[PDB]
Amino acid sequence: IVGGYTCGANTVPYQVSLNSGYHFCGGSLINSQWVVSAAHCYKSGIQVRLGEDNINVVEGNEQFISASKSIVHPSYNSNTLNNDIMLIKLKSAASLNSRVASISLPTSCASAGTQCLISGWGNTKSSGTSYPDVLKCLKAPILSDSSCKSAYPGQITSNMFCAGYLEGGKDSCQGDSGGPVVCSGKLQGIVSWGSGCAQKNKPGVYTKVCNYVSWIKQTIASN
Ligand SMILES: [Ca+2]
């Protein structure tokens, strides 16, 4: 997250770190046994780390749980990033309380102009590289359909939206992929892609979660 602020310990209690000997992606806890993340983050041997704030120090509150299943959406396209969503089943249920909690799925799409919270442990610089120890947050609005398509001609599907800032300096970034975009207490997006990070006229592009609510519930119920 570039241009964001330190969230504070366990103020985003649904935020997870996906770990393979290092932090590589984010995700969102949606019930005690299941996490939602981005398909482009798929790999085998995932450990899910819940209740994290400082990802390099054991502070108390963490729960580390192995992934037992990782289900990439069957229509995921790795060139376009269409259908960039995956579901991870935890090997055992997480223990939920005030510091570890699930986030609700949407019950309608969010409009243009709605303010959302985006969070993660990704790069905090637009040019070079610097990775934070603690969780960073950014408030960003959802942009209009037309501005999104003007920004990325021919690349925006109906399963994507843009959010952020067209003037530069505030965006999600590498290492934030798969992390949550929450508006009014609902998970509306998943951090997916963008051109650099925090460049002028190039906002972040997010998977539109409300299009996948029925798929998510059926996939959970079957697995
Ligand atoms: Ca920690």
Numbering used by the authors: 16 to 34, 37 to 67, 69 to 125, 127 to 130, 132 to 206, 211 to 219, 221 to 248
List sentences from the manuscript.
The RoboDiff forms the core of the services offered on the ESRF beamline MASSIF-1 and, thus far, has been used to mount, characterize and collect diffraction data from over 20 000 samples since September 2014. In all three cases diffraction images were indexed and integrated using XDS and reduced using AIMLESS.
For trypsin, the structure was solved by molecular replacement (MR) using MOLREP.
